[PDB]
Amino acid sequence: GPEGFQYRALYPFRRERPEDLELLPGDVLVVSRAALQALGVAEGGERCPQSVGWMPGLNERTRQRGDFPGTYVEFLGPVALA
Ligand SMILES: [Cl-]
């Protein structure tokens, strides 16, 4: 199976915590399967980010990593990683 998943931010998120990840609408985020497994997301729950809650991820526009709310993003599908 796929090493990761892509999401697209739909709504701006301003960092609240040191480890938060800033979002602007249209930002593509990559989340690794290892990271969802590690949070105990059950197989295929990646398709409902509103249910995962907060996720760690790479924001491709900023190049930063950190935590962001799944309710601010839509699932795009599976990807290869760097
Ligand atoms: Cl801050």
UniProtKB/Swiss-Prot annotation:
Assembly information from the UniProt record: Heterodimer of a regulatory subunit PIK3R2 and a p110 catalytic subunit (PIK3CA, PIK3CB or PIK3CD). Interacts with AXL. Interacts with FLT1 (tyrosine-phosphorylated) and FLT4 (tyrosine-phosphorylated). Interacts with NYAP1, NYAP2 and MYO16. Interacts with FBXL2; PIK3R2 is a substrate of the SCF(FBXL2) complex. Interacts with PTPN13; dephosphorylates PIK3R2. Interacts with XBP1 isoform 2; the interaction is direct and induces translocation of XBP1 isoform 2 into the nucleus in a ER stress- and/or insulin-dependent but PI3K-independent manner.
Coiled-coil intervals: none
Family according to the record: Belongs to the PI3K p85 subunit family.
Domain remark from Swiss-Prot or TrEMBL: The SH2 2 domain is required for interaction with FBXL2 and PTPN13.
Domain SH3: residue ranges: 2-78
Disease / disorder: Megalencephaly-polymicrogyria-polydactyly-hydrocephalus syndrome 1: A syndrome characterized by megalencephaly, hydrocephalus, and polymicrogyria; polydactyly may also be seen. There is considerable phenotypic similarity between this disorder and the megalencephaly-capillary malformation syndrome.
Protein name: Phosphatidylinositol 3-kinase regulatory subunit beta
Stated role: Regulatory subunit of phosphoinositide-3-kinase (PI3K), a kinase that phosphorylates PtdIns(4,5)P2 (Phosphatidylinositol 4,5-bisphosphate) to generate phosphatidylinositol 3,4,5-trisphosphate (PIP3). PIP3 plays a key role by recruiting PH domain-containing proteins to the membrane, including AKT1 and PDPK1, activating signaling cascades involved in cell growth, survival, proliferation, motility and morphology.
Modification after translation: Phosphorylated in response to signaling from activated receptor-type protein kinases. Dephosphorylated by PTPRJ.
Domain of life: Eukaryota
